[PDB]
Design a protein around this ligand. Structure first.
Ligand SMILES: Nc1ncnc2c1ncn2[C@@H]1O[C@H](COP(=O)(O)OP(=O)(O)OP(O)(O)=S)[C@@H](O)[C@H]1O
Lengths: 156, 179, 61, 57, 156, 57, 61
């Protein structure tokens, strides 16, 4: 009151209401694990990118633009092709569950500004200020404080 | 064997399976005993969670006939389908272990008692509906039972101690001992 | 290294030397995994030096 | 109940704004249900290999 | 007379004819299993979606629009291709039941407003009121009562 | 019998409305035949190899 | 065995099977017919669907 001091005491003693503008902005500043050099990201199934996607055909977009008595509104060539591969691989034993946990995970990281394999700190605009959140350091109590107190108030 | 009591051997002797209770177990539990169809067995149903079990028990007999070559569906008398464990049951199922536990301590005469809040501290920190309480019984033996002997190594256990387990909801962690 | 593995070794001995739970299950089965290089065998060679003070109670199969 | 009233109502679809649609309660969103899985899953993965020494009496 | 009380007594004692407007609407209200959080739906063969489907070609729709002396009225490219796969998979042992059992389950759910893998409560407009029916709680006696009695009558 | 009379009749097809077509009896629809299978196939399994519940007397 | 009686052993002596009613049982109907308009037929069709069972019988052969 400095940054590592707040992570222990503000859970026990200090409320967020009695903190200055130079103290709130530095807890939203990135930590010292940021600016630490880290190679070798761990690859996973990217739910962001769609391998079954295709290109705008412009004759579908013309025919679907003229609204009326059409019965299917996409191409279904690449998305049937994809389903045939899952019928032919015979990969079941962890694909029954690795994806399920992952969807819930990577989906929650989308509400924090964090992409798929991003094990580091990513910002999130709350009001007029950015808050760098993590996979581990979610900083949820700062988010509940800055949304509720600084709705009609400004603390940089 | 499930058809009649007889089977021959290479002697062609009469093997008798009468007066032998024959018990067939298998899992077949994935994709329906999951979080699939069974969130919150807290309530557990006087009129309702029966009815989910009134089709989950049907859906296994679908997989009984189509996996086992359904003559077992003809030969077996009673297909028993277990309900998932309720947290209201584990208050005593864990307590059923401490009576077996003191049989290994009745030589030493340690009597061990566990609060109901202590059980709640265990279930919420060891149990899920999906693993079926085996690691919770590892949680007893590999966490709490390890230091009862460490309470005995250093001389804090008199050979008559009324061990009373409790948690006073601070995440503080105490064993209350009486002589 | 790996004090959490060493505690799990010690705890089974605490389950052993104190008359704790010993059914027909042997005390402390262990499955060690790691990269080639690290202290995977020579935990156990130090057990025979320390749990038995002999080094000839070590049975390599 | 509130979503079937506006659905059955004789209002033009251009008048349906996000101001006119009542919000779902907090039990019924993806923000709860995705965070509730990390209350299970993340907690669950540690149900294997429960820590020796982390719970001291 | 409350909601769980009616499920036991109205089969034995109480007729539906002597029930008030605040009592009929609450039995058609969803149960307490609704608003209970339930992940992990169980996937099955969706009879709703047709994998053999295709797109409106607009030269067939023009040629079939001019009525007269045409002999086939569809495309038959994606359908034939599908039948060839069933000849080549050699999957028979339960698929002899899958086309022959499982539709009855999903076809009857189409008369109740319930989609394919939907193990929860789905509404159904009867007259001017909605009735939430289930896979298990069919609520058939409410449907026979609201159609017959409230044809020219209104009970919310 | 009623469907062949209107079929053989000299009426224009634009005059054939759902009011002019007589309804099938309730034995002859999909609503009966799909519900009759759940009277068998649900029931068929709920009394095959299962006979402890509700055989009280 | 079904063709002849005279069957040598591993002592290569003949073992008769005359006056022995040999009975051959197997299913070969399981999980493949399952209605054939018949398991929903307790009346079974007294002049009509008996011919179906004949065509069921013919198929098995
Ligand atoms: N913590 C340690 N203390 C002392 N010596 C160690 C330590 N870690 C490694 N060593 C040495 O490195 C080797 C470790 O033995 P091992 O565990 O057998 O190594 P390893 O190369 O992984 O072979 P493995 O485990 O059988 S695949 C020995 O030669 C030790 O002298």
């Amino acid at each position: 009151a400095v940054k590592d001091i707040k992570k222990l005491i503000e859970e026990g003693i200090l409320d967020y209401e009695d903190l200055t503008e130079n103290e709130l902005r530095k807890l939203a500043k990135p930590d010292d694990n940021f600016y630490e050099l880290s190679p070798y990201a761990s690859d996973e199934k990217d739910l962001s990118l769609n391998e079954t996607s295709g290109l705008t055909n412009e004759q579908l977009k013309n025919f679907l633009g003229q609204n009326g008595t059409y019965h299917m509104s996409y191409d279904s060539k690449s998305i049937d092709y994809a389903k045939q591969k899952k019928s032919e691989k015979k990969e079941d034993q962890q694909e029954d569950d690795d994806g399920f946990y992952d969807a819930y995970k990577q989906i929650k990281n989308s509400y924090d500004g964090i992409p798929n394999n991003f094990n580091h700190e990513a910002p999130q605009l709350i009001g007029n200020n950015y808050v760098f959140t993590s996979i581990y350091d979610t900083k949820e109590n700062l988010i509940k404080f800055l949304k509720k107190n600084s709705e009609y108030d400004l603390y940089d | 064997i499930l058809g009649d009591g007889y089977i021959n051997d290479n002697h062609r002797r009469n093997i008798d399976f009468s007066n032998t209770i024959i018990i067939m177990t298998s899992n077949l539990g994935a994709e329906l005993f999951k979080k699939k169809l069974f969130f919150d067995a807290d309530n557990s149903g006087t009129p309702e969670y029966k009815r989910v079990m009134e089709d989950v028990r049907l859906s296994l007999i679908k997989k009984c006939k189509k996996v086992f070559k359904p003559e077992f569906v003809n030969r077996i008398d009673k297909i028993g389908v277990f309900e998932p464990l309720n947290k209201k049951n584990l208050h005593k199922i864990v307590a059923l272990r401490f009576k077996k536990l003191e049989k290994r301590l009745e030589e030493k005469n340690i009597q061990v008692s566990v609060s109901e809040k202590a059980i709640d501290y265990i279930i919420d920190q060891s149990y899920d509906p999906e693993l079926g309480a085996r690691p919770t019984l590892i949680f007893i033996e590999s966490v709490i039972m390890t230091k009862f002997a460490i309470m005995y190594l250093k001389k804090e256990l008199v050979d008559d101690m009324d061990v009373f387990v409790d948690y006073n909801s601070k995440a503080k962690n105490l064993v209350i001992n009486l002589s | 290294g790996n004090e959490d593995i060493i505690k799990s070794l010690s705890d089974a001995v605490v389950k052993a030397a104190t008359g704790m739970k010993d059914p027909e299950k042997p005390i402390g089965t262990f499955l060690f995994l790691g990269p080639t290089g690290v202290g995977k065998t020579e935990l156990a060679k130090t057990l025979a030096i320390e749990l038995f003070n002999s080094k000839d109670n070590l049975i390599r199969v | 109940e509130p979503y079937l009233k506006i659905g059955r109502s004789h209002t033009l679809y251009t008048h349906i704004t996000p101001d006119a649609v009542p919000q779902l309660p907090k039990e019924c969103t993806l923000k709860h249900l995705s965070s509730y899985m990390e209350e299970k899953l993340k907690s669950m993965e540690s149900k294997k290999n429960i820590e020796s020494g982390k719970y001291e009496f």
